[PDB]
Amino acid sequence: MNDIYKAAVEQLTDEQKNEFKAAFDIFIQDAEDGCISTKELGKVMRMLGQNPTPEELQEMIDEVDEDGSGTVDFDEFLVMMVRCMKDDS
Ligand SMILES: [Ca+2]
C-alpha cells in the first residue's frame, strides 16, 4: 500500500496538472492507445521545466512505469511528481 500519492496529490496544484495535461495531449495528438514513449520522457521534461541525465531519467521511467509495457500514460506521467515521495532507500 502507498499513501504518498494522496499526500503528494494534495501538494500539487491545478496549474501543474494543467501543464502536464497539455504536455501530454501534445504528444497524444495521434497516439495508438493514448500514451508517450519512455525514451521521449527526456523530451517532455525539457518542455515542462527540467534537465536530467539519461541514467537519472531512466530510473524515473521504470519507477513510474506501473505496467512496464513500453509507453508512458498519464497515470505514469503524473506519478513522476508524487513518486519523489517514495525514496525506496
Ligand atoms: Ca507503460
CA of 87 to the centre of ligand 1 (A): 21
Helix (H) or strand (E) holding 17: helix 14-25
Q: Which three cell numbers stand for residue 1?
A: 500500500
Query: For residue 21, with 0-12 CB atoms within 10 Å meaning exposed, 13-18 middle and 19 or more buried, which class applies?
Result: middle
CA of 69 to the centre of ligand 1 (A): 4
Distance between CA atoms of 45 and 51, rounded to whole angstroms? 7
Distance between CA atoms of 27 and 39, rounded to whole angstroms? 13
Distance between CA atoms of 48 and 1, rounded to whole angstroms? 29
Q: Cell 519512455 appears where?
A: 38
The CA–CA distances, whole Å, from 69 to 1, 14, 76 equal 22, 28, 11
Q: Which residues have their alpha-adjacent CB atom under 5 A from ion ligand 1? A: 65, 67, 69, 71
Enclosing domain of residue 51: 1-89
CA of 10 to the centre of ligand 1 (A): 24
**Total count of domains within the chain:** 1
Report DSSP state, residue 67.
Answer: S
Q: Cell 508512458 appears where?
A: 72
CB 7 within 8 A of CB 80: no
- Please report, for the domain that includes residue 63, its CATH number: 1.10.238.10
Specify the length of the chain in residues.
Answer: 89
CB 79 within 8 A of CB 3: no
